[PDB]
């Protein structure tokens, strides 16, 4: 018997086969979950990547900055899962910050429009998704978002760290609203993961100094983590998201679970 | 298939049928775990209470303040589980603070010997148990302890809160040592639970003012918790301990999971 | 000898005589600081209110959302303090969240444009001010911003709490940039203060339920605070801002000082 | 006019001229405070070191583990400051952990008696001192203790970190009791300081690996700190203690002020 046997779960954020959400979707399906997927802009690309998941899952277009996509979301989901069926889980694995807000570009040089775009996609959208999906969620349901520990400032991450701080605050309020539906809302704070974007940054896409800093940050992470950290393996992160989607953390809400090898609990 | 299918788990802290550890033991057995239990002082009492668990589990005497009990523990466990078998899980559900360190008795009036006894049992023993059990634990293993959020001072709990602050610090160091064995170490910070001791305190066993404060603390907790809090139900806490004992939080260590209805994430 | 004797300090955020920044400006002048003030929109109003300060201070127009005001700020300040003189201190006491983002209006109903306006003014502007003022700041300088503890979600404050979480994150990055100039950056997290806006909210300006919640929040605050909390007295907050502007906290940066009567350190 | 003009302050913890408390005492006297000093065991040594302070200060014997010294403390202080005079400030700058609880000696190998001694001196004594001194403290008074950020586990510091976690918890309760006298209670969390004991540890007194780890910890600290960290300079720490002893942080209690160059607010 699967951990998510009989659960209907919406998974957003797949772009490539290295996306954290691809691994969340794989593990959830291995655990008996019936999935509905949401994708942004490049849907032909997303459909081909998701064809490799162990089971079939309908794909729906969702640009979190689009008011029409959000207003029609619940109707499109229920149409994909069948009338009279509701979701048991929602996975928010969406994040973006324009290049001006990250890397070698000075912190003070990011124009507000770019910061605002990044916060809209990375933080506000967590509330936006919950607003659209809570009316079609079952009691005992679970909303999970992806976080990167922003409690301390760090090189290169810059305004994305600010967006994550706002996300953690948004999550605590989403928990208040979700509670009225008998639904939990939590974040998984993951360690660094070698996604296509991350590999590009290490490769110097956002500047040499930013690349050097991010590579050093990842090395320090594995060193600190009492059980180590493998940036090339998103499976421990995917399993943690599934733990929160399950009935096994029923008294946890407005909270953050750290899937970071325990690195944030250690100084050196 | 059970969440803890094939896992060998040691569970300490059963005294009565309302002990949090009784519920941890029940849920773990419902989930396919094979248990070994440890009990303090009143073993005839503990054996009769544990007879009501869905499956048989050997009972071993363990006074955490006794150096001989700790030195012979691993040998006694392996004798109960069979030579060549190791533990996959350890549950520390032990806590005690002499009456002088709690309730209406003034904070400044607790003599050091009493505070020291309370910290020995409630905090140091987490390290003591890990030292005794880590040599007989399998990689991928998990040690879980019971916590009561001590980040803020609260009426009546007094020196027990101080002992919990020390426990959280001990846990982060146990995580460093346990990591070398491929073992995780975490705490479950539970909301208030109506154990025999708790009911006695509400009943005024530690003074009227302390009883009034603890009853008010519990009411505020349910009010704050976005999903509510049922002090009479230890099952959500027991399930959370099992989530940490499972393979579903594999990247979490030196950490604290809050099974408190989300009360600590809300101000009012 | 005054605490801020010989210091040139910029103070933003005065709108009325009950503004926290009015009290910051008064105490700073009582302590020998030479001030330059910034005001938003209603400058005739601000000039008349600031006429009541114990000493004269030049007033400069500053709309933090205006790119031209920010680009000319340093030039206007240096013109007011004299060529060859730099600032020793900067006070950010600016906050705003459109009504849709606060009170009885549901959390999910705040449109992004309103949230974005609120975050621009309340969080991004802390970075904006530092970018404009750091080139005209002396080593040993200090930037202070006003915070309202957003670590936990609370009724009514809603998106303003989210903006404060973003502000705390912005502050840690401003500290990195300010450090290069030998300048500190910190926040003062104040308890609730009966400003004109706060009195209006208690009076039901943002809805009855929000008014009731905010009044209850303030009462709980004084109760929890080991030294109490007087919402009608901004002087303890003003003194704390001056402590950070002084040479008496020289090793504190990227940090938060709580001037809340110790309420955040107590559960009940 | 001095920051502590007319204040009567008790300063414990002087052992050598590099003790943090020596610098606290110097800065306080430079700021007009009238001091009373307490010393442990080697009083002839302490008297000769304190002779170098800018002004005379009476020295009283105080072993925090001695019940008689604590019971007679208030009487001895009032005798030194004159009948009808009370203290305005108390500085707790006392810390000790037996060698078994620190360095290369394994975390699990520290016997409870040694851990208990270390917690008695380093944490319980903060409550012990407050109990003895609060009856002879004026309203508006301030108690300050010395902390080393224990929120994360770190190599070598081991059980001393556990003692600091307990100290932070003790401080929040001392704040509750001190509030009844109109007195504040706070901790100063300092960065690493090259005291005689610290230099000895870097020199390998607690083992080579511990020495290497502590030297690395200090280097990382200066690197992270946006304003840097000078382990050879206790003056910024001494000034911060004086800020808390002054009337300039009147709304801060049960709290922790970080005098660490802002290192704890930065990840890398
Ligand atoms: N990679 C890491 O090291 C790391 C660590 C911790 C947390 N996270 C977080 O995990 C989440 C997933 O990112 P990832 O690392 O797997 O990278 P990714 O690039 O694989 O996924 C990000 C996703 O966001 C989507 N997205 C962007 N703008 C959108 C919009 N307007 N509407 C809808 N979707 C939009 C993209 O299509 C993409 O699928 C993000 O929240 C990220 O911040 C990443
Ligand atoms: N009850 C609550 O509200 C609450 C909330 C959060 C956390 N906790 C924690 O949960 C844990 C379990 O306590 P509980 O609430 O179930 O109460 P309990 O009284 O049922 O269990 C405490 C156990 O500690 C054992 N113990 C005491 N001294 C011992 C010693 N010297 N050696 C070995 N065992 C010893 C007792 O025998 C008992 O089985 C404790 O750590 C407690 O602090 C309790
Ligand atoms: N009142 C409280 O209970 C409380 C508690 C903690 C923190 N704070 C914070 O203290 C700060 C000062 O607010 P206050 O409570 O004294 O109220 P206030 O209304 O007196 O001051 C807020 C100021 O922000 C200014 N402002 C708004 N939009 C601006 C813009 N576009 N450009 C420039 N300035 C702009 C206003 O002109 C006003 O002077 C804010 O950051 C607030 O969030 C308030
Ligand atoms: N040195 C650092 O890097 C550092 C950093 C942060 C915090 N701290 C803390 O600062 C405080 C002062 O220590 P320090 O670093 O200046 O070292 P220190 O050795 O100079 O001072 C410690 C003092 O504690 C006293 N003490 C020990 N046992 C005692 C007892 N039984 N009764 C009374 N006094 C007793 C000693 O006599 C000594 O004066 C301690 O709490 C320490 O943990 C030190």
Pocket of ligand 1, candidates A18, A95, A201: which has the most ligand atoms within 8 Å of its Cβ, to mutate?
Answer: A95
d(CA C207, CA B131): 58
d(CA A191, CA A168): 16
B235 near B27, Cβ under 8 Å? yes
Query: In Å, what resolution does this model reach?
Result: 2.0
φ, ψ at B133 (rounded to 5°): -100, -30
d(CA B85, CA B78): 7
From residue A81, alpha-carbon distances to A77, A134, A139, A244, B132 in Å are 6, 15, 17, 22, 51
B240 near A252, Cβ under 8 Å? yes
Closest-CA residue of D relative to B64 is: D112
Residues of A in contact with B246 (CB under 8 A): 243, 248
Ligand approaching nearest to the C-alpha of D190: 4
Stretch (H or E) spanning A172: helix A158-179
d(CA B188, CA B147): 6
**Residues paired with residue B185 on neighbouring β-strands, in sequence order:** B143
Q: Is B192 in the pocket of ligand 2 (CB under 6 A)?
A: yes
Secondary structure (H, E, C), C124-175: HHHHHHHHHHHHHEEEEEEEEEEECCCCCECCCCHHHHHHHHHHHHHHHHHH
Report the atom number in ligand 4 closest to the C-alpha of D192: 3
d(CA B152, CA D169): 8
Interface of B with A (CB under 8 A): 1, 3, 172, 175-176, 178-179, 182, 184-185, 190-191, 225-229, 236-237, 239-240, 242-243, 246-255, 257-262, 265-266
Q: Is A234 in the pocket of ligand 1 (CB under 6 A)?
A: no
Give me ligand 2 centre to Cα D175, in Å: 28
Residues of B in contact with D176 (CB under 8 A): 107, 153
Give the closest of C112, C169, C177 to A161, CB-based.
C169
Residue D92: half-sphere exposure toward Cβ, Cα within 13 Å: 34
- Residue D54 burial (C-beta neighbours within 10 Å; 0-12, 13-18, 19+): exposed
Residue nearest atom 20 of ligand 2, based on CA coordinates: B19
φ, ψ at D259 (rounded to 5°): -110, 70
- Pick from A225, B233, B116: nearest CA to D153: A225
φ, ψ at B39 (rounded to 5°): -135, 150
Asked if the Cβ–Cβ distance from D248 to C243 is below 8 Å, we say yes
Closest-CA residue of A relative to D156 is: A268
Give the E-state strand segments of chain B in sequence order.
8-12, 34-39, 59-61, 87-92, 137-147, 184-190, 255-259
Report the atom number in ligand 1 closest to the C-alpha of A192: 3
d(CA B145, CA B250): 17
Pocket of ligand 1, candidates A42, A64, A94: which has the most ligand atoms within 8 Å of its Cβ, to mutate?
Answer: A94
Q: Identify the chains in contact with B, defined as 3+ C-beta pairs within 8 A.
A: A, C, D
**Residues paired with residue B90 on neighbouring β-strands, in sequence order:** B10, B143
A169 near C162, Cβ under 8 Å? yes
Interface of D with A (CB under 8 A): 152-155, 213, 216-217, 220, 264-268
Alpha-carbon A90 to chain mean position: 10
Total domains in the fold of chain C: 1
Q: What is D42-104 written as a DSSP string?
A: -HHHHHHHHTTSSS---EEE--TT-HHHHHHHHHHHHHHH-TT--EEEEEE------GGGSTT
Give the closest of C175, C227, C265 to D182, CB-based.
C227
- Pick from A126, A104, A102, A129: nearest CA to A114: A102
Output the six-digit token pair for A27. Answer: 């593990």
Residues 6+ apart with CB under 8 A from C250: C140, C184, D236, D239, D240, D259
Ligand approaching nearest to the C-alpha of D148: 4
**Count of H-run helices and E-run strands, chain D:** 9, 7
Output the six-digit token pair for A241. Answer: 């998201």
Q: Is A236 in the pocket of ligand 1 (CB under 6 A)?
A: no
d(CA C255, CA C147): 11
C14 near C92, Cβ under 8 Å? no
d(CA B99, CA B118): 10
Alpha-carbon B21 to chain mean position: 7
Give the closest of B153, B155, B216 to C265, CB-based.
B153
Question: What CATH number does residue B82 fall under?
Answer: 3.40.50.720
Output the six-digit token pair for A108. Answer: 């003070």
Secondary structure (H, E, C), chain C: CCCCCCCEEEEECCCCCCCHHHHHHHHHHHCCCEEEEEECCCHHHHHHHHCCCCCCCCEEECCCCCHHHHHHHHHHHHHHHCCCCCEEEEEECCCCCCHHHCCCCCHHHCCHHHHHHHHHHHHHHHHHHHHHHHHHEEEEEEEEEEECCCCCECCCCHHHHHHHHHHHHHHHHHHHHHHCCCCEEEEEEECCCCCHHHHHHHCCCCCHHHHHHHHHHHHHHHHHCCCCCCCCCCHHHHHHHHHHHCCCCCCCCCEEEEECCCHHHECC
Stretch (H or E) spanning D181: none
Classify the C-alpha dihedral D24-D30-D36-D37 as positive or negative.
positive
Residue of D97, D115, D171 to mutate for B, most B C-beta atoms under 10 A:
D115
d(CA A190, CA A171): 16
Asked if the Cβ–Cβ distance from D108 to B127 is below 8 Å, we say yes
Interface of D with C (CB under 8 A): 1, 3, 172, 175-176, 178-179, 182, 184-185, 190-191, 225-229, 236-237, 239-240, 242-243, 246-255, 257-262, 265-266
Closest-CA residue of C relative to B150 is: C267
**Residues paired with residue B145 on neighbouring β-strands, in sequence order:** B92, B187
What is the per-residue burial (b if ≥16 Cβ within 10 Å, else e) of A105-125? Answer: bebeebebebbbbbbbbbbbb
Cβ atoms < 10 Å from Cβ of B131: 18
- Pick from A149, A92, A154, A91: nearest CA to A123: A92
Give me ligand 3 centre to Cα C107, in Å: 21
Alpha-carbon A239 to chain mean position: 13
Sheet containing strand A87-92, strands side by side: A59-61, A34-39, A8-12, A87-92, A137-147, A184-190, A255-259
**Crossing angle for the helix pair B158-179 and D158-179, to the nearest 10 degrees:** 160
Sheet containing strand B59-61, strands side by side: B59-61, B34-39, B8-12, B87-92, B137-147, B184-190, B255-259
Experimental method: X-ray
Tokens 């008996």 belong to residue = A32
A144 near A245, Cβ under 8 Å? yes
Ligand approaching nearest to the C-alpha of C192: 3
Q: Is C94 in the pocket of ligand 3 (CB under 6 A)?
A: yes
- Pick from B89, B121, B136: nearest CA to B245: B89
**Residues paired with residue C98 on neighbouring β-strands, in sequence order:** none
Alpha-carbon Rg of chain B, whole angstroms? 18
Q: What is B50-71 written as a DSSP string?
A: HTTSSS---EEE--TT-HHHHH
Residues of C in contact with A176 (CB under 8 A): 107, 153
Asked if the Cβ–Cβ distance from C265 to D172 is below 8 Å, we say yes
Domain that holds residue C229: 1-268
């Amino acid at each position: 018997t699967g951990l998510l046997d009989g659960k209907r779960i919406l998974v957003s954020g797949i772009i490539t086969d290295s996306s954290i959400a691809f691994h969340i979707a794989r593990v959830a399906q291995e655990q008996g979950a019936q999935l509905v997927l949401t994708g942004f802009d490049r849907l032909r690309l997303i459909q081909r990547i998701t064809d490799r998941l162990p089971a079939k899952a309908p794909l729906l277009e969702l640009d979190v900055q689009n008011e029409e996509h959000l207003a029609s979301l619940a109707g499109r989901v229920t149409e994909a899962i069948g009338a009279g069926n509701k979701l048991d889980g929602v996975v928010h694995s969406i994040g973006f910050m324009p290049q001006t807000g990250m890397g070698i570009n000075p912190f003070f040089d990011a124009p507000y429009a770019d910061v605002s775009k990044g916060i809209h996609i990375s933080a506000y959208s967590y509330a936006s998704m919950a607003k659209a999906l809570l009316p079609i969620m079952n009691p005992g349901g679970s909303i999970v978002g992806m976080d990167f520990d922003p409690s301390r400032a760090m090189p290169a991450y810059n305004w994305m760290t600010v967006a994550k701080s706002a996300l953690e605050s948004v999550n605590r309020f989403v928990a208040r609203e979700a509670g009225k539906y008998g639904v939990r809302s939590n974040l998984v704070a993951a360690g660094p993961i070698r996604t296509l974007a991350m590999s590009a940054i290490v490769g110097g896409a956002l500047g040499e100094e930013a690349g050097a800093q991010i590579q050093l940050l990842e090395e320090g992470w594995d060193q600190r983590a009492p059980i180590g950290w493998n940036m090339k393996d998103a499976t421990p992160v995917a399993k943690t998201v599934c733990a929160l989607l399950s009935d096994w953390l029923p008294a946890t809400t407005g909270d953050i679970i750290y899937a970071d090898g325990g690195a944030h609990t250690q100084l050196l």
